[PDB]
Design an enzyme around this catalytic site. Sequence first.
Site, PDB file in Angstrom:
ATOM      1  N   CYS A   1       0.795  -1.199   0.056  1.00  0.00           N
ATOM      2  CA  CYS A   1       0.073   0.221   0.018  1.00  0.00           C
ATOM      3  C   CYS A   1       0.743   1.300   0.024  1.00  0.00           C
ATOM      4  O   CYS A   1       1.637   1.592   0.851  1.00  0.00           O
ATOM      5  CB  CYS A   1      -0.677  -0.060   1.140  1.00  0.00           C
TER       6      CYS A   1
ATOM      7  N   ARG B   1      -0.078   4.648   3.039  1.00  0.00           N
ATOM      8  CA  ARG B   1      -0.161   4.374   4.359  1.00  0.00           C
ATOM      9  C   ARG B   1       0.442   5.592   5.261  1.00  0.00           C
ATOM     10  O   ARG B   1       0.285   5.371   6.455  1.00  0.00           O
ATOM     11  CB  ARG B   1       1.025   3.166   4.615  1.00  0.00           C
TER      12      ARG B   1
ATOM     13  N   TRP C   1      -9.209   5.894  -0.585  1.00  0.00           N
ATOM     14  CA  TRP C   1      -9.638   6.571  -1.758  1.00  0.00           C
ATOM     15  C   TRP C   1      -8.902   5.900  -2.882  1.00  0.00           C
ATOM     16  O   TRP C   1      -7.834   5.290  -2.633  1.00  0.00           O
ATOM     17  CB  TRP C   1      -9.647   8.000  -1.786  1.00  0.00           C
TER      18      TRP C   1
ATOM     19  N   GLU D   1      -5.267   3.225 -10.607  1.00  0.00           N
ATOM     20  CA  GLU D   1      -5.896   1.745 -10.298  1.00  0.00           C
ATOM     21  C   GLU D   1      -7.258   1.740 -11.523  1.00  0.00           C
ATOM     22  O   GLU D   1      -7.465   0.684 -12.127  1.00  0.00           O
ATOM     23  CB  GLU D   1      -6.652   1.711  -9.087  1.00  0.00           C
TER      24      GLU D   1
HETATM   25  N1  LIG Z   1      -7.040   2.590  -3.298  1.00  0.00           N
HETATM   26  C1  LIG Z   1      -6.862   1.359  -2.614  1.00  0.00           C
HETATM   27  C2  LIG Z   1      -6.958   1.092  -1.357  1.00  0.00           C
HETATM   28  C3  LIG Z   1      -6.883  -0.080  -0.690  1.00  0.00           C
HETATM   29  C4  LIG Z   1      -6.880  -1.232  -1.734  1.00  0.00           C
HETATM   30  C5  LIG Z   1      -6.917  -2.502  -1.281  1.00  0.00           C
HETATM   31  C6  LIG Z   1      -6.909  -3.819  -2.300  1.00  0.00           C
HETATM   32  C7  LIG Z   1      -7.232  -3.481  -3.609  1.00  0.00           C
HETATM   33  C8  LIG Z   1      -7.320  -4.681  -4.472  1.00  0.00           C
HETATM   34  N2  LIG Z   1      -5.892  -5.218  -4.935  1.00  0.00           N
HETATM   35  C9  LIG Z   1      -6.295  -6.166  -5.843  1.00  0.00           C
HETATM   36  C10 LIG Z   1      -6.885  -7.557  -5.375  1.00  0.00           C
HETATM   37  C11 LIG Z   1      -6.679  -8.738  -6.530  1.00  0.00           C
HETATM   38  C12 LIG Z   1      -7.513  -8.262  -7.811  1.00  0.00           C
HETATM   39  C13 LIG Z   1      -6.673  -7.737  -8.981  1.00  0.00           C
HETATM   40  C14 LIG Z   1      -7.605  -7.421 -10.180  1.00  0.00           C
HETATM   41  C15 LIG Z   1      -8.707  -7.777 -10.068  1.00  0.00           C
HETATM   42  C16 LIG Z   1      -9.555  -8.092  -8.999  1.00  0.00           C
HETATM   43  F1  LIG Z   1     -10.836  -8.402  -8.770  1.00  0.00           F
HETATM   44  C17 LIG Z   1      -8.729  -8.479  -7.711  1.00  0.00           C
HETATM   45  C18 LIG Z   1      -7.321  -2.074  -3.916  1.00  0.00           C
HETATM   46  C19 LIG Z   1      -6.866  -1.020  -3.075  1.00  0.00           C
HETATM   47  N3  LIG Z   1      -6.876   0.553  -3.674  1.00  0.00           N
HETATM   48 CL   LIG Z   2     -10.189  -1.439  -7.873  1.00  0.00          CL
END
Ligand SMILES: Nc1ccc2ccc(CNCCCc3cccc(F)c3)cc2n1
Ligand SMILES: [Cl-]
Lengths: 362, 362
Positions: free
Chosen positions: B65, B68, B237, B242
């Site tokens: 992350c 943080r 957020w 992403e």
């Molecule tokens: N802005 C943030 C904050 C926290 C987050 C925590 C987790 C995730 C998701 N990580 C991906 C989980 C695995 C994945 C990858 C691609 C598609 C999907 F459905 C799942 C995004 C965040 N994005």
């Molecule tokens: Cl997402």
Amino acid sequence: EEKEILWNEAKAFIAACYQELGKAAEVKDRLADIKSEIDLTGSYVHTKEELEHGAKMAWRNSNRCIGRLFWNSLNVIDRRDVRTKEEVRDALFHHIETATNNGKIRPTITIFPPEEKGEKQVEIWNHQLIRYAGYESDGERIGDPASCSLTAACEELGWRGERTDFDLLPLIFRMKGDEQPVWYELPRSLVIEVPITHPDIEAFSDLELKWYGVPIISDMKLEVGGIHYNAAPFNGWYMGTEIGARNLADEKRYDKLKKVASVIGIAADYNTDLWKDQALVELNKAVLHSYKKQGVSIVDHHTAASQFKRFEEQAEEAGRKLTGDWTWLIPPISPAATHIFHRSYDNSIVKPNYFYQDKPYE
Amino acid sequence: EEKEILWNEAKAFIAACYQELGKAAEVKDRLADIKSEIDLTGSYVHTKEELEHGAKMAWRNSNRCIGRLFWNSLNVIDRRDVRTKEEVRDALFHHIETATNNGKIRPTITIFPPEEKGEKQVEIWNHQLIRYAGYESDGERIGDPASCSLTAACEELGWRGERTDFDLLPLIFRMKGDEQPVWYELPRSLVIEVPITHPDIEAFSDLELKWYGVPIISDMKLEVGGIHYNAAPFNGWYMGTEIGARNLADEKRYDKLKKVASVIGIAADYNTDLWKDQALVELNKAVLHSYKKQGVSIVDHHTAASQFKRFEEQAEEAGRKLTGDWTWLIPPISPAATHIFHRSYDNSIVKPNYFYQDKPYE
Ligand SMILES: Nc1ccc2ccc(CNCCCc3cccc(F)c3)cc2n1
Ligand SMILES: [Cl-]
Ligand SMILES: Nc1ccc2ccc(CNCCCc3cccc(F)c3)cc2n1
Ligand SMILES: Nc1ccc2ccc(CNCCCc3cccc(F)c3)cc2n1
Ligand SMILES: Nc1ccc2ccc(CNCCCc3cccc(F)c3)cc2n1
Ligand SMILES: C[C@H](O)[C@H](O)[C@H]1CNc2nc(N)[nH]c(=O)c2N1
Ligand SMILES: C[C@H](O)[C@H](O)[C@H]1CNc2nc(N)[nH]c(=O)c2N1
Ligand SMILES: [Cl-]
């Protein structure tokens, strides 16, 4: 211990090399010869075939290299016969000319005599045979900061640069038995450079950027079957991002993104405008366009990754394990648009290979 | 073994947590209480202070992350009191409303009762509380491919989507003691969405792209002091990449780069034109512009990395070891323009933390 290390590496290399060359039946006899030779002399000498294939295997095993599809077409120049500084200089000049090949770059390596007792015969000080000087004094920064320490070392030795941002460093290398290296200015007739222009933004030439055509890395050690070729300059051709995303863009290199933003007509005021990203794309488009226009080989990162996927496929077809360093294989712009980003790689070190070694200056 | 594992994790967590809270003197007595409680009940219950600080530590320790810096301002909602599916549903609805906060997003986590004997009390099937459906049949692809298996599972259970490319999935979760999960359609009044437009290319709206405002990850396990909170949805957020570099750009997601290239007026014919890179930059500029215009919190990757550098500095100042996963911290566009690319990080796992867990569908 040294001898045992050598013998073990030799046994592994010869077995693999001769297997790949369809010469499996010759291994036993060759190993016997090598073993006597190690006993009586402390080392062994590679056949020309061994040396050529070993340098190719070393490229194939370079985890950080996206260009490996072409590993088997390396042009290997065997210069283990050199004994004098004029011979070294002339071999380096020759490498520049034959690798450049009028812009249709030929992947080439020139191999000089290997270390003996860990004693270097030829020690090349250049990071690349063609590279720009860097200066830093009195707040004033000129040229390529990555070259500051080598530039200082050359100037200690009587070389003086014009102090443009693109001074070509001299070739600089030391012979066994000499205390100091010698240096030689590069003949400009041997060096192709590419002025950087943009396919549709005319002002881009106002930046007066250029870069040299052929990256000839001359400070890594080629290790083959326990023999250490510390002096073995090699080249491929550039991937455009090495110039456009790093050499000309890094804040600790030529640091050109603000100037690029200005000539492409965008503000460089707000992170949310992604002006650095936009400037990076246009600078990288310009670098690719400019090399293509001058007839100098170059590859973009998309095509390079596509070639690398074929390398992965080729390894599979050959039944060879694939190794790679994800952190270096991803390109520094749009990495997730390449397949590399979306898979993982085993970063194990396999020999023959190319290795960093300590700088003799610094 | 289970109990010993729990006790060891509890001892480490309580010591660290109480140290950070200036409550070092209370540790001995609290540990005694916990140890009796583990003996007699097989588990222990966190104080509210422990739970809040543990969820904050878990964010602080999330190696992947970049966000943080803000770990200590997490809003922790303690819902260990829920026993019914209506209570769960209403807590999830509440989380959406309070985290959304009219667009000024509040980082929030809602914590439900933890596993007992490894037995889940509440099992949330959604990957995020707000997420789009995906369909694939008869060659026909609609919506978000990443959601295909969960979408299929919902439709098995009587839910039916409109089959737009942006259908909101229902909340879907299972209670201890029930064989099947229950599902509830999301009230549209709770869900902010952002239409994607571009600051100066009017045609960009022809793509009819949108995305939802708040990413509320609802399928990771929060582990604190040996207690497994498998149901503990959280959000920050978005970082714009992403959405713009992955969700809307990946070939295996919405795969929009060719369409983007067309609306921005560039050919998508030659790799050397870097059209994918250019399309990525404009799509990412559009996403940032659009969220800002709608008053929904978002951060660009440059500002995010700058905040992350301060997190590195804060950790240093606090005398805390820093852990990170370089391969996830670098942004997927212009990674080498961020300081992250140019340093390395220790990817060691420290608890409390958030962990993936197996999907109950699939
Ligand atoms: N802005 C943030 C904050 C926290 C987050 C925590 C987790 C995730 C998701 N990580 C991906 C989980 C695995 C994945 C990858 C691609 C598609 C999907 F459905 C799942 C995004 C965040 N994005
Ligand atoms: Cl997402
Ligand atoms: N003022 C400067 C500075 C650096 C320079 C570098 C090179 C040259 C002239 N380079 C000519 C290269 C022509 C060439 C073509 C094909 C192959 C090859 F090896 C060299 C002039 C400079 N002039
Ligand atoms: N196109 C190619 C082919 C082979 C290459 C081999 C090595 C390198 C150089 N790798 C970097 C060596 C360490 C370094 C980083 C930055 C500046 C600097 F002077 C040295 C580039 C290549 N580029
Ligand atoms: N056809 C569709 C499809 C999806 C939709 C999603 C949401 C909405 C309406 N959303 C209103 C959200 C307003 C709002 C403001 C502030 C906070 C908050 F939680 C919700 C309409 C849809 N209409
Ligand atoms: C510190 C970090 O390893 C460094 O930035 C690396 C990462 N990946 C890289 N990848 C390539 N190809 N070249 C580099 O110089 C680097 N730098
Ligand atoms: C296979 C590879 O690990 C995968 O592409 C990872 C790399 N880095 C990443 N980094 C982030 N932030 N998010 C991701 O989904 C990924 N994907
Ligand atoms: Cl270079």
